[PDB]
Structures are given as C-alpha cells and as structure tokens.
Amino acid sequence: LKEMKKDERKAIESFINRMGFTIKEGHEGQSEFDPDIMYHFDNDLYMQVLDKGKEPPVLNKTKINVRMEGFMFNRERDSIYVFNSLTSGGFQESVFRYIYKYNDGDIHFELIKCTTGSNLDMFVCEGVAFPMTMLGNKARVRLIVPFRIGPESLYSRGLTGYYKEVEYVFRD
C-alpha cells in the first residue's frame, strides 16, 4: 500500500512541474485566492480558483449540480479515463447535497443518484465537493485530487484525478 502512496507522490511531483504551476500553502477558512496560484490545503487537495463565485451555500440545505472536465493519470500512464461535461453534450449533470458527516473521514457531500441517462456520478468525490466550503454559487475551479480522497470505485487502482475545470451551480 505504501508503494501506491510513493507512486502517487512521484506522479504528483512529475505532473506539477510538467506545466507552469505555482504551488503555495493554504490554511482553512482562506478567503483571498490569487487567480494564478495553486494552493495546497493540507488535505492533499490542490486548488486554483478561477472565479470565487457568489453567496455561500447553506449546510444540509443546498443541492448543487456540478459539471466537470478532466482526466485521470497514474505515475507512468496518463489519460486512463477522460471525462467532459462542460464542452461536449449528452451528459446529465451530477447533483449532491451539501452536508457534513464523519463516517470514515471528512465527507462533505451526499450524492443523489441520477437515473435519467449517461452521467459522471462515479467521478464525484470528496475532493470535488471540498471547494464548496469556501467558495459560492457559479464557481469555477481547477483541482488535482489524490487517490485517498478520489472516487471510491477507483480506490484500489490508486488513480490520481486531475480536474481541468469544475463548475458548481446551485439548485437541482
């Protein structure tokens, strides 16, 4: 298992310097985000807020739909899975309720399963729902989610997700 952690550390290090990225440190409750700096948030999550958004969500009340575009990579092989909902059509939005519950770790979402066609419910994880603790409605972010807070289905394979752009909009 520790080998998977080491391989993920190597993959993250080789990916961050592959394109121009400025890694900084982030503290909880941060409010001011440089629109050109990627932050490290102590939960191994990497965030670069392209737009802060609007009014913050209400806990255990707001239901949010997300549209994400990006791909997943490994230490040596990339583009194992590619997903897109912001540009290509034919994909139902993914809906989650904003909650807080410590079942095993920090869980900030309750997914509402979509039963009306093809979607990306298996690409919604803790890393995707985390930026809602700070940002607001109509929010656009870029994320690098390690396997620990990645999708639960793709946990054994130890894949690292890179979300090129995730957009959050309130309501169903």
Next chain:
Amino acid sequence: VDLQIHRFYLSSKKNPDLEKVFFSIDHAKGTIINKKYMPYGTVLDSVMMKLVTDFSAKKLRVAINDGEYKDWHNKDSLWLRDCHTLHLMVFDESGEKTKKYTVTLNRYDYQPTTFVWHMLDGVALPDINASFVDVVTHADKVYLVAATGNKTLLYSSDRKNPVHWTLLSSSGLSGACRQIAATEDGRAWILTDSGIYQSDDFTNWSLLPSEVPVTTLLGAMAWPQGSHTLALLAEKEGSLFFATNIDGIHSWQEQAPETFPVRNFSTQLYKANNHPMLRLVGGVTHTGAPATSVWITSNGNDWFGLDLAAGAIPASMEKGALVQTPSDGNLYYYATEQAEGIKRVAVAYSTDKGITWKRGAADIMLPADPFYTVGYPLPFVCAFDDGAYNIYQLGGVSSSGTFFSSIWKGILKLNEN
C-alpha cells in the same frame, strides 16, 4: 439420473424446413406432438432424428408405423415418406429399464385455405342499374345501397336468409349516394353531393348541418360515451386534410399523405385495447392511380399505413369488398385485378386480426362460377358476412343487363364442421 427426452426434432439433407418445426413432449402420456401442422405437400424421404437426452440414455430403438423395433444410432437417415406414427423405446446401459414414446406427425392432408361454395336458390335480387353499390349488415339485417345515377335506392334482407329483398322508402335523402358509414348501434351516415345525412333506421334521413364541403366520409366511431365521432377528409386551400365531426362540431387535423385513397375503398370498424378502431383497405389515390396499402386509425386525427408484404393487397380501380368471419376472426378482401388484360377477382386474406396480410390463390378461395372464368363484367364487387363461418358473394351472372343475379354462400373447409 434416468431416461427422459428433453428436445426432439427432424432434419433432412435436402429439406432444411424440418428444423423450424417444433415438437412438444409430454412425459405423463409419453407423446411427442407437433401442434403446428406441417405444411401441405411436404416430403419426408430421408430424415435424421436429432434428440437431446440425458447421459444415462445408452440404447434407443425406433419402430416405424407398425414395423419392427430396430436398434437406432445417431448416424441413421431413416425413411418416413409415408409415416404418420413412430414408436421410441429408450434403454439405459443396464438394459432392463424401459420408457415408451409416441411421435405423431401432423400434416395438412389438403390445402389449408380451401373453401366450399354453394348456390342460393330462389334469390330475387332487383335488376338495378347503378354505379356505386355497397352492403351494410346491422344486427340481423343486410341493407344494400345503390347510387342509380342522380338518385339513391336502399334494399333490405335477412342476414341468415338473404333470399328475399325488399325496397325501402327513403325519406329526406337527396342527391346520389357517394359513400356510407355505420356504427354498431344501427346509426348510419350517408355522404352525397349535398351535406351528410344521418339516420337511425335507414329510412328517415336528416340533413346534418355543416359548412365545410366534405370530399369523403372515411368512417364513423362512437368513442366519446354518448357521442359519435365521424372521420372525414376535406379540402383546405389546395390540399386534403383529415377532419372530425364529433357531435356536429367541425375540426381540422393533420395533412393527408399523397398516397391516401379518396374513392372506392373498403372500411371496417373493430375494437382493440378497449378502444374502437378503423381499418381502411384499397381505393384510388387523389392522382388517379390505385393504392395498395392498409390504413388504420383510432381517433380520426391521423392515419398510418402498415408494413405489408410485396404487394399482397390487390390493386383495383373500383370498389372492393372487405368481410370478416368473427368465429375464427379471419379477414378477407375481394378486389378486381387487371391481370394480363383481363379483369379477374383477387383475394387477400389475413388470420392475425389484420397484423399481417398474404395474397391468396383465386382458384381455391373464390367460387368456381363458370360465367366469371373469362372475366368479371360487373364494375364492382359486393360481399357481406353472416356471423359464423359464412360469407356471401353476391353475383353469379350479369343478370338482365347490369347488376348481379345470384348469391354464393361459402365456408372455409377447415371450419366446415
């Protein structure tokens, strides 16, 4: 583990159709029966019997008709050209355990679509000169409508005994009968040159008020409880549109396709899925060419055609005749086909309640009337059903001038008894 048969079938090197035949196996009585009859005229010269059995099955013995039990092997092509019963005996490796099976081959000894026909004696059909003639059966009464030039005549007779025909005194009617329609409760409509006329007794006719000049009366329904939907085809601008006349109220609907008939078509009203439905067969297109499609509908707003075979429906330039036998639910359509320069009668039959239609052989289905061997001088075909395995085929000769004279009654042979 013991001795049983789970699947059994026949296959021929020269005949591949034996594989599709399915056999049902009853262990309680030990009988193998093909419940679907094998097609007439088949040949069973050399055939292999392929059967799926248990592993414990070791020895098999086959007896043909009343022959001898012969030790059977999987590589035997047996001879059963004239064989209708077969006996099978299965043994295990021990040899003492036995089980008997009887296989009976079901085949049509004659043509499955043969008909038997008879003259009706004493018939007194009126000698009437008319262009459009139709027959409508309600309860236990047949009514024949004829468009004699500019006028309209109606005659009545008994469904069971159509021997005697009586003229009816029509009151309120005017113009020439273009088309007729009727529901199951006896109410009838006739479209003439003037507006539509309505009656409940085929005698007293009231002019239905309207403004849009209708072009054809397709049919009538009684779907809204207490009302009477009336499907119509009218002319708007320079195209044809479907229309409804539900309780006098007029409405416009979808645009008719270009292959939709306007004249000399046969209509019928039936029921499916707890809903009245209309079926329309044959006719002449708006351009003038004949139409060879079947159109059904449920509300009169729009119609759609079925996916038939390669020209199963005969192409006719004049009125056909659509009849139904309700006891077996069979549909028949008689039309006039211009085959090799001669007007003959062609029959299209259906047994799947109108789902599928197949062209039939005229010489077997139709009567053997000598006067119609060389052609069909009359410009229309009339036929009405009876209610149980009985059809009437008005017309033996051309009579004194025009119109039919004699009546033919026919029964499907399969349902003779």
Next chain:
Amino acid sequence: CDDDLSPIGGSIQPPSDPVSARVDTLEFSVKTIPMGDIYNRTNYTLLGDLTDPEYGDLKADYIMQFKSPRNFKFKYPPKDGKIDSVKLSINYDSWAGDSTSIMKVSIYKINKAIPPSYYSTQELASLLDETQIIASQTFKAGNDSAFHRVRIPLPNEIGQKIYDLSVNNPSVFDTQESFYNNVLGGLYVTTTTGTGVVLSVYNTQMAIFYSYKVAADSTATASETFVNTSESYQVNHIKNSQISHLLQENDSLSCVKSPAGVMTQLTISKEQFTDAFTSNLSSSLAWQIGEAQFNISASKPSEGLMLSPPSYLLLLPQDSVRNFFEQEQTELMQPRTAFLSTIYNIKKREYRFSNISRLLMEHIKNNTEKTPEGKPYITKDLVLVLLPVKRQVAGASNSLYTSQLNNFMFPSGVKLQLGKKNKTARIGVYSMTYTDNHH
C-alpha cells in the same frame, strides 16, 4: 435482585398523582377528488395514450428544449463542412400497456417560449398557435432484443445551422435564452393516433453525425449528442379523461389514479375531536395520545386491467401537499405529519402505516381555542390525502432510508377499501389521562 411490580403503594398517594388509559374510536369521512397538476422537477416524461375499462383514458405528450453547452466548438472540422444526418433518439426504460401496439409519433417545431413552471399542464392551447411538422414515424414499444430507443431522422437544416453558428458566426452557446432564440427552438413530441401504450421517456438526444477530418486520406464518422436535462423548463401535457364515474359517491371503495387523476381525501370532523379530548368542565385533566394504528386493505384488482396498483402511498395533510414537493422534502424530514406505507405485496394486498398519534397531537396542539366561558375546543377539521409516490432508496442493505420521494409519473390505479359499510374508516386512539393543576 427482584423485579415484580409491588402493588403496596397507593393508599397515601397525592390526589393529583394517579393516571389512567382510555380508548376512543374516530371516524374518517372518505371522498375521491381530482388530484390536480403535479410538481415534477426530474427529467421523466410520458409519451403515448392509454384506455382502461375501470379507470378511463390518459393522453400524455410533451415539449422539450435542449441543454446548451458553453463554448461548444465541436471537434474534427467536417469534410468540406456540411453533415450527413441529424437522427433524434427518444430513450425509454419501461412502459405501461401493450408492448405490441403500434403508435404514430410526430415531432413538431414551435416558435413560442416555454412558460416557467414545474407543474404538469392540461390544454396547452396557447403554445400550439402555428407549429411546424418536422417528422413523423410509426413505432411499437417492444422491438425484441433490448433496443429501447425510438430513432427518427430529421432534416439536415437544423444540424447545418448549428454547425454554422459554432464556427463562422458568434459563439452564442453561452446563455440558454440565446441558444433557444437563435440556434434551435422548442420541439413538440406527441402521438397523433393509435392507442394502447404509454412510454416513460427519461431523455431525448439529437446526434449530428458528420464525416470526419480528412484523416490522412480516409474519413471516419463522428458525432455530437445535445441531450436535454432537468435544468431547463419542459412542458408535460398529462390529460386524464372520462373519470367522472370515479368521482361519484360509492361507500365501500375509494380510487387513487396516478398521473394526475384522482386521489383519496379523509376528513375527521371537529366535534369528533371536541367530545373526545379536552372537553369536560374541570379543566384539570389532559390527554397524551400514544397509539393510533391505521392500515388500509386494497381491493383485489379484476383481470384484464392494464393498470397495476402503486407500490407506495404517502398520507399527509392536504394543506402541506404543495410545500412538501416544492421543497423536495422526504418523510424522514417531516416525521410528525407525513407517513409512508409499506410495499404493496400481493400476499395480503395492504398498505400498512403505523402509529400516527403524532399527527393527531400536532392537529390538537395548534387548533385549540377557548370560548369566552372557557370550554376549550377544536376549531378546524383534520383533512388528509393519500398520494401515489415514487421512492428512491440508498444506504447499506441493513439500513435502507428514503433518499428521494417524488410524485409518481407512471400509469397506475388502485381501489382502496374505505367506507361506512364494513367500518373500515375506524381508528382506535389510545390515550393517557393524567391530571395537571399547576396552571
């Protein structure tokens, strides 16, 4: 170590200590009333027509609008521009009726704006002012194998216009209003004729299939999709007809039809509340209702029916029926006023609720007034309705909980046994009568 209820104490008990138990029988009054327009947020729609002998008719169709992606700019410039086909796919998962009845589906193009509302409508007369026929095709529900789709070719003009607007024209695929007013309008999907089936359509797509980039010196088909989602506004036209015989008085049964249709309303009078609790003249007693069972037995459905009973029923007051679905709540979020039955199982054919005493407590609590000479009394009747709902579950197998509760959008019908003939509208309210004089 001994646990037996000693009876010794009681001869020196204070006069205001002792308690007691009581039972009161309460009567419902049962009616069947039109359900009304239903709130529907999901993407499910119904397409087709149905006729049932004991339940009347239903005609369902809809109007849809496609979801516009931002900066569409689809790949692989089509060879010399242009495209090949614009086939539109209607996807359905299940149906009600006969899987072999032939229907005729027509696709029109409208030029109006879809009204903002999530309620199913009837008589959409204003929208269909001009319209324009695009396509029409016959189909049947069950097509063998598992190809549960309806594929309808469309004219190439709409796909060509979409492609043109994405390259040589401004990228207007930004706001939904701009996409609806410039790129593509609203599509009206209906069945012009035929009867016997209703499809539960869950989405509809419009695949624009183009040639490809030249691909060295070959070419290989590629395509777009343009699905519709629940973020936009649809129009569901659900119309139930000839159900007037279900609304007439019949004192042994009450019907609940699902798509709009009819529902069962239960009314407890005010006097029945007044001379069963509070009341009296001492004004020192009080009631604490602790048990009130309520179970309903569904009548055995007759053979030949096309509609089957709904799996779940929701019992809730009629006043809280709007805000229950507009806020997308769940029976676990209002445990005091909304109750969910159990699975309709053909072994016993009954919907079993449980102790509803909290509902009666809630009704008594905030509807008790006093006449000028004391005499507390109830001022309003208790009105409840039974609705057919669709429940979506989640959680582990041992712990299953109601994740989502929506209004049921599929043809169904049930005849419950509630009336005066066999005393089926009876509840036995078990209460505790203590005394309390600290006022």
Next chain:
Amino acid sequence: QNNNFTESPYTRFGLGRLGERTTISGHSMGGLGVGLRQGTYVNAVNPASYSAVDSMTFIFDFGASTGITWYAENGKKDNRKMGNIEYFAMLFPISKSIAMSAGVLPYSASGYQFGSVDQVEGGSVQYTRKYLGTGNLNDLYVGIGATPFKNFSIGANASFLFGRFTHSRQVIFSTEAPYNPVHLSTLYLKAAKFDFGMQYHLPLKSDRSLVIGAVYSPRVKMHSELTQIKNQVQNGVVVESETQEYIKGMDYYTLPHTLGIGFSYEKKDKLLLGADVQYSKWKGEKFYKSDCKFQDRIRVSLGGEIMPDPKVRYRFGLHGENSYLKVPTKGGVYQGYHIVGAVFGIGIPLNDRRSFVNVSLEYDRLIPKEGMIKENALKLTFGLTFNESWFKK
C-alpha cells in the same frame, strides 16, 4: 432501578426518610451520639467528642449493612431486600488537646417503586401503570473539637450537602408500536450546614464519670434547581422530550433548627448508660409544591454497654421517634406515624489491642394511624474500626 437503602412508599414526600449521623458503635447503643464521650471511634453527632482521642491515633471507621423489610397493606403483603455502605470517616489528633475529623455520612435517602396492570377504560387491551422514585441527599463534613477549659469541651462541624431527587410516573401500552409517556420531575439541591456542640465531662468518685452534652443546628436555606420533563419513548427515548417548567434559585427549600440534649453515666471498663432527646422544628419550613403538612419531629434514644471481666463488649439500645410530616390518607385528612426500634450488637476486639470489629442486629417497626402501609424491618450491620498509631517519633 436500584434503590439500595429503602423502598418504602412513605419516602415519596419531603426529603425521604431522615437518616442519622452516627457510626456503628453509636448506632448499636440506640443512636447515642450526644452524651457519649469515648476516644475509640467516630462520634460525628456531637463534634465536642473529638477532643477525647489519644495522642497518637488514626481512627478510620468503615461500615456496611444489609437487611430485609416487610410491607403490609389493606389485604396485600410484600417483602424487599436492601444493602449498602452506611458511611466512612476518619479522626486524628492535631495538638495537645485539639482533634479533627472528616468523612462521608448520609443525610437522607428516598426510594420506591409500585404500580399495577389493568384494562384500558372502555376497551379491551391491557395497560401498565408504574410510579417510581429515587433520591439521595448526602453529607460531606469536616469537624474540629477542643477542650480549652478544664472538664469542658466544644466542637464545630462544617458540612457540604449535595443531593438529587427524581419522581417519575408512566404508563406502558400493549400494542404493535406505541409511544409510552413518562412524566418526570428532577430536583438538585446544594447547601452548607453547620453544627455546634458542647460537652461537660465531670469525673465522679473513684472511676464514675458523668457526661452532659448539647448540640445545635441552625436553619439552612438550600440552593435548588427543579425541572419537569414530559418524555415519550418507543424503545429508547424519542422526540418530544419537552420540558414543562424549570425553576431555579434559593429560598425555596429549608432545613429547620435542631436541638439535642444527651446525658451519660460511665463506670470505667464496667458499664455505660446513656440517653438523649432530639427536637427538630420542622413546622412551618418551606418546601415548593409539597403534598404534605410538616410537624415538629421528636426523637428519643436510650442505650447501654456492658462488658464483663470473654472481652467482647455488649451493646443494647431502644429508640423511638415521631414522623416529621403528615401524608394525605385516602379519603381523609393529613395523618402521621411513629417509629420504634431495638438494637443489639457486639464489639469484638482484635489482636493489636487497638482495632475493633462491630456486628449489630436491629429490628424496627413503623406504626401508622389506620389503613396505611405497615412496615417491619430487620437489619444486620457490619463495621470496622481501624486504629493505628500514627504521629510517632
């Protein structure tokens, strides 16, 4: 739930049964706590007796008890078993005359449980009614005694009183899934009590000795917090735990003035006789929502110790008292009751000539007026007095 000390229904009113502040040796002599002056055990009743212990001693006094109680009624009978730890205290010297003591003693205890099963009125199914109650008011005390003037001694006890009393009443239905109601009342009490005692010990001719003692306890006002809850349960407690009322403050509960006079005659190592009278001014003291009328409480005790020349000391005693409250009799007026009792015990010495093992047996009877609960209780008490020689050079 366990009640440990008592399950008498009479403890439903007031602060329950009023306990005493005597150890095993004092209790075995009928409750003699005022007149006794012996430097061998703890005599927390009269603090002036502290200044009688030897110069190098650490007396640690433990104790426990068990027993049975028989309750009788109009026609019914019942019996219950008790058993618990009575107290524990310590006493050591401080200077040439001054001594100090500490420990934990019970001030009062209360507990009961009863009810019955009946049929739902105007119905068919059955239901159970249960009335429960527990409560304890403890006492953590520190005392000091001295003898400044010859043949005269004084003492003072400072006590911290903390306690809790709960009374509950409930009905249990017998259905598929009911909401059983429980009406509950909780009361928390804190205070600070003081006791002042004086003693005069005149040595008579030869070996005879006379002891005369007095003890006084001022009125105490107690800080109180009362809560009334109305719960509904299905298997565990569920929603609607509504609190009906909550009242907090002082000046709602009081403890009365107490006076005690005791006399004792002691022939050394041969004979000890003593008696004492205690008066409590419970009349007119406040108690919020009390369902009874208080009355002045009188306690009379008399006992003796005889040991011949094995060495086992013998103790006997008789005590009586009147009730301090009037419970409401069924269909009548507030009435009281009396209590009488007899105690006999032994005081076996041990090998180191300093420790003691005491075993006592007590029988007491409650005498009501008429038509009330009758109680006869038997009790066996086992003590231990560990006397070690500390403070040695």
Next chain:
Amino acid sequence: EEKQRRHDNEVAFNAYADSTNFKKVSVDGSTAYVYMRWITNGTGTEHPIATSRVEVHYQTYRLVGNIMVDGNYNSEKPARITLYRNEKDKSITGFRIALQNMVIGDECEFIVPWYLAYGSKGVPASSANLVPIPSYSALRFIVKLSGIIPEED
C-alpha cells in the same frame, strides 16, 4: 470448506423429508425427486407439459441462512417462465419437476437439492441480482401457478 458446505446442504435437504408435511414427488422416468407441499389447492385438471411456458409468482431461498435471492411477489402481473424448450431457453430441473405436477390455482413450496438446481456451476452475483448463489446450494421455492400458455403460440 466447500465439502462441508455440500455436506450440510444435503443433510438439511434430507431432514426436509422426515419433516412430515412435505411429501416427496417425481416426474415419470426420473430418479430425481423434489420435496413439496400443498399450501393451497387449485381447481383444474391440466398439468403443464415439459415444453410449456407458464406465468407464475415465485420466491427463491437458500436452505443455508434462508436469504432471499429472487422474487416478484411485489408486482401484480405474473412473470412468464419456460420449463424447457432448448439449451438457451430453459429452467432448473427441480423447477420443471415441481411445475409438472401442479395445476392452475395452486401455491406450493418445494425444496430442490444442489445437484438439481445448479450443481457445481454456481451463480455469480454480476449485475441485476446482487446476492450470488454459492456453489452446491439447495433452494427453497414458493410458486403460485396462474395459468398455462398454449403450445400453439
């Protein structure tokens, strides 16, 4: 391990014999047998044939643990099942043996041993069904027959 699984499955099935209530039954010419009851008795004298398709309401249980694996009892329309048509369209042997003796209107419970239900093949959970069938599992069926499809179809 699995051998002990076969052993306790067969010891349980065998106990369902002496459990007097449930008579043993078999089809003609087969040593195979299935233990069955007669919860309800129907009207009619038409038994299904080995090649007949019958629509029923059914529930399936394992003998070990009695875990529900399949069932359509929470629906009004009966499900159509075929006894035996070919190697692709069929059902387990015990199901055929049980249904060949019933009649329209019956509701019977029958115990099918491991070697008549699935043998050693085993049923992986896969999609749809979530509870897999362990290899060599005896089954407990409750089947209510509603009618018989004619062979003409």
Next chain:
Amino acid sequence: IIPQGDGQTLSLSAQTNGKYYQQYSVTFMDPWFGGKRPDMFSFSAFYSKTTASDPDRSLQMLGTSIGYGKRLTWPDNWFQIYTSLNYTYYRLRNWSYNTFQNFHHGSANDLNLELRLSRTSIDNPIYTRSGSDFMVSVAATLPYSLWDNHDYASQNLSVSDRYRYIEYHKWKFRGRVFTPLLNPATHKYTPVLMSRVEGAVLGSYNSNKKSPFGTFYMGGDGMSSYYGGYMNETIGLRGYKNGSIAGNNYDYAYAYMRLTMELRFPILFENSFNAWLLAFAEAGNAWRSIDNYNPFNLKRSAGVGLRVTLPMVGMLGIDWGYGFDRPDNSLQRGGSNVHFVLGQ
C-alpha cells in the same frame, strides 16, 4: 532489567504487540540526588504509536516527565510528598475511533503540574498483613481559555483551535487498610481483613471545553485497552462486563468511586510461592457529569476468587463475581461473571 551503575539506575523496557501498539520507554532515577538526603529525582521518557482498511490511521504520543520526591518528617517519618512536571504531545492521522470525542485528525499538547501527598506503612506488598496506604493527588494545567479569548460556545470554531491546548484539573484519592484477625507470631496462617476506598474527579475550567484526554473506562476485570488508546484510565469492577458501567457506546465518564471489602485466607507459604483465597464485596459507579456524584446509591457486587504469586511472573488469579444491579443505560443485571487478573 535493572542496569545498576554510576550510583543509580537506568531501568528501561519496551512492549510491542504482534500486530500494532509499538511502545518504548526509558527511566532514570537518582535515589540520593544532592548527596545529603534520600531525595528522589526521576526522569522518564516514552514514545508510543498505535494503528479499504487503515492506510495511515495512526496515533502517536511523545511523553516526558520529571519528578522530585521527598521523605518529609513533619507529620511523622513516613509522609512522602511528590512534585512532578509532565508533558505529552498527541498527534493523530485520521483516527476513525470515536475515542477522544471528535478529535480525529489534528494534534494536541498536554502540560500538567502534579502534586501528590501520600503515607504508606504496609509490610511486604506481595501479601500484606498489617498497615495502611493513603494518597491524595492533584494535577492541573494552565487555563489558556482565560487568555486566548477563543469562544468555545459556538460550533464554527476550528477543530485545530479547539483540541490544541488541553485544560482540566484532576483530583484523586485512595485509602487501603489491612488488619490481621489473629496474631501473626502465634499463627502463620491468619485471615486478613481489607478495606479500600478510592475515587477521582476530572473537572474543567470552561463548561464547554472539556478534556477528551484522560476520561474513565469502568467495568469488568480491567487491565488495558486492546482496541483503542491508553489515555483513558481503566477501573475494574468485579461482577460486571468490561466497559458495561461506563465506556461502551463510546460514553466515557468524568468521575468515579469504588469501595471494596475483602477477606483473605492464606493457603501456601513456601519460599517465594504463595497462594490464597479471597472473598470480596464491592460497590462502585462512574458518572458523566460531576453533579450526579452520589457515593451511596452505587452498583453492588459480591463473590469469591483465588490468587497465586509466582516468581518472574508476578501475581496471577481468577475471581468470580455476581452483579446485583443493572448498569445505567442497560436492562440486564451484571449476573455471574469470571475475571482473570494478571500481575498487579
């Protein structure tokens, strides 16, 4: 292992279970620090770490302590005051167990000053015949809540800001008494009467900020925790299940009291092998809030047992106890239970 040398000792030990809970410890004491009087100066340091499954679910603790102990002669030449200064650093890596309330991921610091006064005059501690043992101890921390000015009443306060500096004030007391029924010189085999009283209170400066570190786990035999951390004191109550009184359902108490009366009958007295039979009666309880402290209505139990002393092993024994009362938040009495005691 006692590395005696340099006029002092350097005893040390380390225990690691075969699956987790690695721990190491070193101790260094000076019996004659200063060179004038037997004033103890002890220094002890230790480290311990304990651990889909668990990727990095790990609890680690760095501990250090100093202690100066005296041999006071003011009351009498037996009182032994003892002052110590202790510090412990807690760090967590996603600790799923509801141990330590909601502290799951952060890290906390503990700094306490301990003052203890005791008097012990018993004979050989293996089998005591006469004497006493008394102890009163206090352990307190710095009230950071009065200076950091962080409002703990609200819920929005950060988890790191909440569980970072531990505040409490813990009090303990204990007293044991032994007495021989018969003369030790005349009879070697003599019954021994024993009485034990002990209790503790864990207060808090702020009514909302309470230490998740150091709560009580009562019930059963009681030796240690085989699934969680060792930062919760385990108190044994014979006649009940393990954790039944307080600790099951993750309910940890903040005060407790236990009273024991025993009677020991010796059996074997040979060289270094002793064995005896004991009959005991116990009463105890533990409360989540201090206000419920009630030293009279406790949970009772009684029974018998057997003890054996063995060289290099320590003490081994078996006890049987019957619990008469139902624990709080339960509906079953203690019943009949068997407890094994290992070592002290």
